[PDB]
Amino acid sequence: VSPQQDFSDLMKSWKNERCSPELLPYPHQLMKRLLNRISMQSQLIENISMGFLDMQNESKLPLLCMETELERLKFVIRSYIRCRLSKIDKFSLYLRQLNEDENSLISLTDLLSKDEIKYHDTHSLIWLKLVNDSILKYMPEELQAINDTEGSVNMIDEPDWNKFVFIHVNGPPDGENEFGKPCYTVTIPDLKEEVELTIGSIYVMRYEVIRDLLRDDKVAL
Amino acid sequence: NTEIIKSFKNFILEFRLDSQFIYRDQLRNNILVKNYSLTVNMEHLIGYNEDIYKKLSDEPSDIIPLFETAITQVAKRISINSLPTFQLILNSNANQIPLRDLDSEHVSKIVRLSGIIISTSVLSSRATYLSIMCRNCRHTTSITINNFNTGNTVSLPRSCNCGPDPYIIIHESSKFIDQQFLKLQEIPELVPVGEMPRNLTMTCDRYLTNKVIPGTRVTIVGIYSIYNSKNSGVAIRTPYIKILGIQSDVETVTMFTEEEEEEFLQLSRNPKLYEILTNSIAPSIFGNEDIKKAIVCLLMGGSKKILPDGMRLRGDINVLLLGDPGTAKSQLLKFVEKVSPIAVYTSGKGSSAAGLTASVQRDPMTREFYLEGGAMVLADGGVVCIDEFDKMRDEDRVAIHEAMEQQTISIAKAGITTVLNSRTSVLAAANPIYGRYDDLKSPGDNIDFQTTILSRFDMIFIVKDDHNEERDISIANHVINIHTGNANAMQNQQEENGSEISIEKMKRYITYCRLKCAPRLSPQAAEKLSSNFVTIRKQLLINELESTERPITIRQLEAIIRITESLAKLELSPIAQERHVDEAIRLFQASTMDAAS
Amino acid sequence: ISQFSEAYNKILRNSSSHSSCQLVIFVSCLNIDALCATKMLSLLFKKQLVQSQIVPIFGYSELRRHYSQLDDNINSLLLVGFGGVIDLEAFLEIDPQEQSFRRDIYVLDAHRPWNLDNIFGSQIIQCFDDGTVDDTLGEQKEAYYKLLELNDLSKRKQRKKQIHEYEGVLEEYYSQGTTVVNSISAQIYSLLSAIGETNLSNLWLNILGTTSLDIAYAQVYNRLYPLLQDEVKRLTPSSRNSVKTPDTLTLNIQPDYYLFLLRHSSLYDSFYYSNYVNAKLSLWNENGKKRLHKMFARMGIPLSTAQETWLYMDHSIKRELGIIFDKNLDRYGLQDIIRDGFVRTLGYRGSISASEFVEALTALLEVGNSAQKLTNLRKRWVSNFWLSWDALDDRKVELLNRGIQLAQDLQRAIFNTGVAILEKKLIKHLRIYRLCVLQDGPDLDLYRNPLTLLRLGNWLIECCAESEDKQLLPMVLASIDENTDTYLVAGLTPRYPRGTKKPILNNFSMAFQQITAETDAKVRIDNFESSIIEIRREDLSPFLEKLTLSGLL
Amino acid sequence: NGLDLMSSITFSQQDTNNLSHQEQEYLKEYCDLITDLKSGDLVDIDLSGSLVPPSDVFIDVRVLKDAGEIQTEYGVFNLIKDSQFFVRQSDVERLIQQGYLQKI
Amino acid sequence: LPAHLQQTFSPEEIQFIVENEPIKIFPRITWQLITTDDKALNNMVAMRSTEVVLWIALLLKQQSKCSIVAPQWLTTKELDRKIQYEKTHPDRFSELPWNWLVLARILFNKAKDDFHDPIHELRGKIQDLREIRQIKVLKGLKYLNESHLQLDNLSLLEINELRPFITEIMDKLREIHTASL
Numbered sequence A: 001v002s003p004q005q006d007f008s009d010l011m012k013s014w015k016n017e018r019c020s021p022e023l024l025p026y027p028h029q030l031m032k033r034l035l036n037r038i039s040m041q042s043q044l045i046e047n048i049s050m051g052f053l054d055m056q057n058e059s060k061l062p063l064l065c066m067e068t069e070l071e072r073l074k075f076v077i078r079s080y081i082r083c084r085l086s087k088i089d090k091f092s093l094y095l096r097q098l099n100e101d102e103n104s105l106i107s108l109t110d111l112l113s114k115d116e117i118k119y120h121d122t123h124s125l126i127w128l129k130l131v132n133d134s135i136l137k138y139m140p141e142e143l144q145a146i147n148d149t150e151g152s153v154n155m156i157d158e159p160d161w162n163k164f165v166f167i168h169v170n171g172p173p174d175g176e177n178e179f180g181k182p183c184y185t186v187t188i189p190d191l192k193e194e195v196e197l198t199i200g201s202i203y204v205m206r207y208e209v210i211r212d213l214l215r216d217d218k219v220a221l
Numbered sequence B: 001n002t003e004i005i006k007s008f009k010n011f012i013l014e015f016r017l018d019s020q021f022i023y024r025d026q027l028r029n030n031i032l033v034k035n036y037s038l039t040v041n042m043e044h045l046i047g048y049n050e051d052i053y054k055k056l057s058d059e060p061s062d063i064i065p066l067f068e069t070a071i072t073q074v075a076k077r078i079s080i081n082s083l084p085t086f087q088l089i090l091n092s093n094a095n096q097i098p099l100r101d102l103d104s105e106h107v108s109k110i111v112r113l114s115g116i117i118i119s120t121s122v123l124s125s126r127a128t129y130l131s132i133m134c135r136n137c138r139h140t141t142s143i144t145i146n147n148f149n150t151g152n153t154v155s156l157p158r159s160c161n162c163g164p165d166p167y168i169i170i171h172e173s174s175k176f177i178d179q180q181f182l183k184l185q186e187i188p189e190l191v192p193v194g195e196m197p198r199n200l201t202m203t204c205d206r207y208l209t210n211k212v213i214p215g216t217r218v219t220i221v222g223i224y225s226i227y228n229s230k231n232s233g234v235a236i237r238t239p240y241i242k243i244l245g246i247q248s249d250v251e252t253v254t255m256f257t258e259e260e261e262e263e264f265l266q267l268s269r270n271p272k273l274y275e276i277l278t279n280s281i282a283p284s285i286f287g288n289e290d291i292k293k294a295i296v297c298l299l300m301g302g303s304k305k306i307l308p309d310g311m312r313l314r315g316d317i318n319v320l321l322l323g324d325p326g327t328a329k330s331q332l333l334k335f336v337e338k339v340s341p342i343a344v345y346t347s348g349k350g351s352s353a354a355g356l357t358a359s360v361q362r363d364p365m366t367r368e369f370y371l372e373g374g375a376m377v378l379a380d381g382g383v384v385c386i387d388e389f390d391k392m393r394d395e396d397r398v399a400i401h402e403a404m405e406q407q408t409i410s411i412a413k414a415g416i417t418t419v420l421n422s423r424t425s426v427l428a429a430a431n432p433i434y435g436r437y438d439d440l441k442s443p444g445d446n447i448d449f450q451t452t453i454l455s456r457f458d459m460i461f462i463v464k465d466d467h468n469e470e471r472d473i474s475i476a477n478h479v480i481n482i483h484t485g486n487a488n489a490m491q492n493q494q495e496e497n498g499s500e501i502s503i504e505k506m507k508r509y510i511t512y513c514r515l516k517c518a519p520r521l522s523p524q525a526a527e528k529l530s531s532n533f534v535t536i537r538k539q540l541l542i543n544e545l546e547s548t549e550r551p552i553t554i555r556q557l558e559a560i561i562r563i564t565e566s567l568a569k570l571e572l573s574p575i576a577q578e579r580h581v582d583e584a585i586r587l588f589q590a591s592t593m594d595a596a597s
Numbered sequence C: 001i002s003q004f005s006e007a008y009n010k011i012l013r014n015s016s017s018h019s020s021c022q023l024v025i026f027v028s029c030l031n032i033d034a035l036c037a038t039k040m041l042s043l044l045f046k047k048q049l050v051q052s053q054i055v056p057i058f059g060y061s062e063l064r065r066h067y068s069q070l071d072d073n074i075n076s077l078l079l080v081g082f083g084g085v086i087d088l089e090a091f092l093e094i095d096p097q098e099q100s101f102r103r104d105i106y107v108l109d110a111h112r113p114w115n116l117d118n119i120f121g122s123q124i125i126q127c128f129d130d131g132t133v134d135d136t137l138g139e140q141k142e143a144y145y146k147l148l149e150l151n152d153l154s155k156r157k158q159r160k161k162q163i164h165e166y167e168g169v170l171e172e173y174y175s176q177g178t179t180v181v182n183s184i185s186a187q188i189y190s191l192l193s194a195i196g197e198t199n200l201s202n203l204w205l206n207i208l209g210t211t212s213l214d215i216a217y218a219q220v221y222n223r224l225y226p227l228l229q230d231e232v233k234r235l236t237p238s239s240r241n242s243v244k245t246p247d248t249l250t251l252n253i254q255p256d257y258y259l260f261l262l263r264h265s266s267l268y269d270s271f272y273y274s275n276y277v278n279a280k281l282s283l284w285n286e287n288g289k290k291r292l293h294k295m296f297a298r299m300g301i302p303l304s305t306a307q308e309t310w311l312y313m314d315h316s317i318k319r320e321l322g323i324i325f326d327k328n329l330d331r332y333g334l335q336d337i338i339r340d341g342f343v344r345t346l347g348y349r350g351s352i353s354a355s356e357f358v359e360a361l362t363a364l365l366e367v368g369n370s371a372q373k374l375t376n377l378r379k380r381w382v383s384n385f386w387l388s389w390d391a392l393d394d395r396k397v398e399l400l401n402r403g404i405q406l407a408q409d410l411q412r413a414i415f416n417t418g419v420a421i422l423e424k425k426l427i428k429h430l431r432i433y434r435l436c437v438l439q440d441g442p443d444l445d446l447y448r449n450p451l452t453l454l455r456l457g458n459w460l461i462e463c464c465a466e467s468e469d470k471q472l473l474p475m476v477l478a479s480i481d482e483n484t485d486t487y488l489v490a491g492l493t494p495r496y497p498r499g500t501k502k503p504i505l506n507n508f509s510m511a512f513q514q515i516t517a518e519t520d521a522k523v524r525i526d527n528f529e530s531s532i533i534e535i536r537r538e539d540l541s542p543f544l545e546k547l548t549l550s551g552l553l
Numbered sequence D: 001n002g003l004d005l006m007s008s009i010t011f012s013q014q015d016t017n018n019l020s021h022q023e024q025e026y027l028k029e030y031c032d033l034i035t036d037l038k039s040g041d042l043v044d045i046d047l048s049g050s051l052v053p054p055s056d057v058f059i060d061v062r063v064l065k066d067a068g069e070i071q072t073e074y075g076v077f078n079l080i081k082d083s084q085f086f087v088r089q090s091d092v093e094r095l096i097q098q099g100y101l102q103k104i
Numbered sequence E: 001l002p003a004h005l006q007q008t009f010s011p012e013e014i015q016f017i018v019e020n021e022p023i024k025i026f027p028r029i030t031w032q033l034i035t036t037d038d039k040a041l042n043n044m045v046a047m048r049s050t051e052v053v054l055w056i057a058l059l060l061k062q063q064s065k066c067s068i069v070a071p072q073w074l075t076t077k078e079l080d081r082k083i084q085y086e087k088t089h090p091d092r093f094s095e096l097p098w099n100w101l102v103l104a105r106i107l108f109n110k111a112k113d114d115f116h117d118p119i120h121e122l123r124g125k126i127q128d129l130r131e132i133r134q135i136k137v138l139k140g141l142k143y144l145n146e147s148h149l150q151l152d153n154l155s156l157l158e159i160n161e162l163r164p165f166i167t168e169i170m171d172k173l174r175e176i177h178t179a180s181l
């Protein structure tokens, strides 16, 4: 739980999102371990600069390195929460359909935090109040709810579920569970032969052939 | 030499300015798309060594081939066989002695010129890689002929009892280059005492040919070597120019960069173009607002519909002026010549009207006929300009009737009978029967007999000579400003640099905005012109009851629909509007009542 | 009183925090030597890691409405060449506030007539008083030192007569002309050597400012032609050539000439300003094209490879000039051409020397763009100033050539009326000076900015640079372009034909105080340099009438 | 999304301020719905731009087309005409997107 | 909500993940570093290697009170063995420091006056490798099978440049293979 360890995991859990086709569970638990830290070190350099003001009725290094560092770490989470908004916007009709009827997944705390589901329900409301009174005044009585029955099925989902993404294999060498000849890797397609990864060779694949192996971070992006 | 070569493969892979490393970074970028060419830019070359330049600028032919072989080897290296040889393109800008140095020291020396190319020829073939067989022993060699002293650089040898010239030229493993024999004419302003100009001859290579149409200014760099043809007294020879790089001005086939239209898109977003061009076109013309609007729509044009049957609609306009002398009907016409992409100035006498369209002659090789000349074959897309439509009494009328309204001529002479294409646009300015008394008599007698030429034109201005005793003193104030003191060179650089458009930017501008957007008028706007026209014929026939005859027919009505298409090419909107179309009739309704007066 | 190493550490601690503890400098833009001194001071502050604020200022009446209204906690103001003569403390009052004051300025004036209140009376005015002048007006040690403290009416009257004796020695002082004795390149570069920062870019920068004064004096840079010869040898980067390196920015010395912009342009073009060298001999328009066609015409110059017969083929032809210019020694005696010269290179891209390089900076400062129109004109010169300061690094290249092509036509433009006024024959020798009033010829618009006018006089002082064994007085010109008769009139200096035995500075600024006090009907000193003032049309004709009688040389 | 005079949606597309003003209730809704999202984070992280990553601390910045006194916070910079600045990086992001300081 | 560069990375932040890896320095100077990823020291002894993160060391060279040491493969006498294992092997490229191209560009801007002869020698031995890598990639993608490629030693720069087309140019052909049946 060292702060170097408590940061390199964050960077790995930011880059993986930035080419993802679909959402991932928002790891709120590690964020709160550092949401206090960004307040504290700002407060640490808050008063410790003021002692340098009151010494002048020398050192210029140790102030400058502190000031640029924590805002640079602040820059990472600035992008990291905007791309959630950049992803939750389009997916709205799908995720409510995952959230309307009871099913295998709920929009949980480890899935989404407080403010974005406060954002989502309000923004999807005001979106519906643009199409209604300005456009759907002459909407007849089969086109009320905006979701596909049949015909053109595009008011439903983002089924981009075999978009290709470059993969870097970073399995922790402990043998442990060893199956293959060079190292322990597995694959299974839907149709083709099970030719697979070895250790760190960069490959290209679809998504549900790799969606299983990313719950356990043994292989990066 | 080999040593010299060792001094160029080791130079065109690490020459750079400060961390850009350019010459590897374009040679790779020219081997992907097939061009196989360099641009050395000799004034930028000098950073190595003045000696290696001076082994070039004092001696020829040897240097070009050694350099070419070095470049081919480097190109070959940037790969790992189908590898052709390359070609060079050199360019500098020292100064252009126009056509004056002829024999003194400028024989086989690097030189830079400026001219106007007028006459292209058909293509040809010379070889560059051969495979030669002997009769007696079936020997097999291969000889490459790259650079020239034309042919007869080296001939086929005698070596392999054995009879001489035992060798032949097969055609199974060969390559070929094309020459041009295009002819350069002097730019007709810089040899002035009293003399006619002269002409030279020049050939070139395939990967820099077919880059010129006749009617343009070009600058050109090359060699001044000498050939000798035995089809004149002393053993003489002839001059010609082997050329290297036509780094001329614009084409004047729509490939260019993106920043050229960036400002153009940044200007077209400002909706002030129409009112600002009337000032910015002609910076030395006192007003003349109604005529000035007509010239910018003539240069742009309309469209061309090949609608799904045989016929077509002639999508262009053709203005016509006439008026008193001293009222700018003539000096305005040289001004449209430079601003046009293609412009021809045959403005005098008609010039033997059968020779305006096409001409044949006995040709000295094979004693045959074909088609060579014409004043309308070279003026496609652009605009011609002529004058004096009174005292061409012989055959000007019979030579423009087929030339207009269909633009599909065909020569019925001794050889071919072919319908060659034309997309021309005419323009003229004439005189009435000495001007004043014509406008103080019965208002006919302008063209003495025929109205049939007037019905082919559509847009007609009539200027006059008032005696406004107020604005004329400003005109007398205007001419002394331009004529001496030359303060308009300093006034139109302190009002133009943020507001107006210079004279050469429009030549850049018009060729882009024509060749991109294909417009169409508004479909609900058709109620406007139909409601407009029905009273104009009533305004016509209210005059013929007064024993008055002549001219308005329906061809001008399908010209107004081209007029409203013209400013749509200016704004580059694919649809038209009604603020658009009401200003167009506002230009034509100031030339509807001209038939009454 | 201020040793050079002391004020650097003194100004260090007074503003070094990482907050808005800003120090600001002001700079006159109209002088070229004023610019280049400031540029090297900024970059050492970058590796001193301090915040800053750079504001130019051009108007001596505009100095009030930049400083004296927008100040919060600015403790360290800094000037370059502003208050050598006129006391700014009477101009801008500062009450004694907080002996160990709270707001501190320096000044970097470069002018010989100083003002003793600024150096003595240093409560806030901490001027650069180091070994600049060790003999700083040696009569000061009893003159005003008895003015500070000021039966006995036969003794005090003698003591007032001593004060009156001290009055005249302070009346002869503040009654001299001005110049710059030592350029501001000399001070700060010597200060940096006391700190010891070795970069040849500094050695490239500091020589430009002393090169700018090759037209307003003769021998101050002849005093420094030794003091660069050591530095190009002490800062020797290499003994070998060490070829093919595109970098390393090497320094050499080759003999260069007053036929300027030569290695950029065409040895042809000397065709204009070789007649300037014949205006430096005897003639400008009459016989020159009949005269010039032997010496500068070793060929009717070939334009086949001419771009590299002033670049490359001159290996043999300018070395023939190397053997022409000792047999053109006697041919006309024309020996204002041989000069030692200095040069820089780049590694590639052709050499550029420093003689022509100051020529591009002056011309590029010009072009590159009731009484309410002046604000939109006074804001133009500050803006186009800014597109020249950036032109001293390799981060920009492709606008340095724009001044090159704007050099060799404006000189053709400035000549195009100089030949007119010379054959107009309107130079009237009245008694002492010569008066010329350019009422209106053509092309009047290029004379609003004053920096063209000193060059126009620099060509016009040379048409009268014949023998003239009597009456060696410079002229005063006149022109007008805009409303209410602005008339930026100016004076010049007389020039020696390189034979200073008598260093004539100026006689006009003494008389300029008189006419700005007597008439008082639209007379102005709002323009910065004292050699240039303004005058009204109905007052410029009685301007000279008070000048033709007041002999103040 | 709020840097200076945010509620001023004027001097911008007034001819299409029959288009957008008739949909301003959505625009205003997004506006107000982004204001609380600037404060719904329990720690103040900026969301008004700054998308390009930082490089260093010290950046040469010029200014033009501007006047008046601005920047009441983080020290007043005394913004006067055509003046060079050479400052810390982290104070200029709320003015570059404002378009008052011009060049990096 | 960028909506401008979302599928990929701009080249202004691929350098941002490599600057947060450490290298060795030569310190000069004598709490001072409480950056939460710091390794502050006491009075620091010169002539001693220490693995320090790069971005503060770039800032440390601005004030100019230190000096960098080059990494172990940054001489021209060392890359010569790299350019022969590839010229005999058109199969793949063997041995790469995996972040090389973005490393030298930082190491030439303001890090030029440190090492013995980088200029006029090293950039010749770099730009050759900038293309011999990418000559190999043009033979590679013509061999595109279905959903299986083999890239072994690719930089972070080239993988940010093959990316934005190679995804959808095989995804679009993934339709006609799959949705055929």
Ligand SMILES: Nc1ncnc2c1ncn2[C@@H]1O[C@H](COP(=O)(O)OP(=O)(O)OP(=O)(O)O)[C@@H](O)[C@H]1O
Pocket (backbone or CB within 6 Å): B284, B285, B286, B287, B288, B323, B324, B325, B326, B327, B328, B329, B330, B331
């Ligand atoms: N409207 C005008 N504005 C400015 N200049 C004009 C105008 N009309 C004529 N001029 C001037 O007249 C001068 C000479 O014209 P020119 O002698 O060619 O007239 P012209 O040919 O007799 O007139 P027209 O073309 O009517 O016969 C030109 O320099 C031109 O500037």
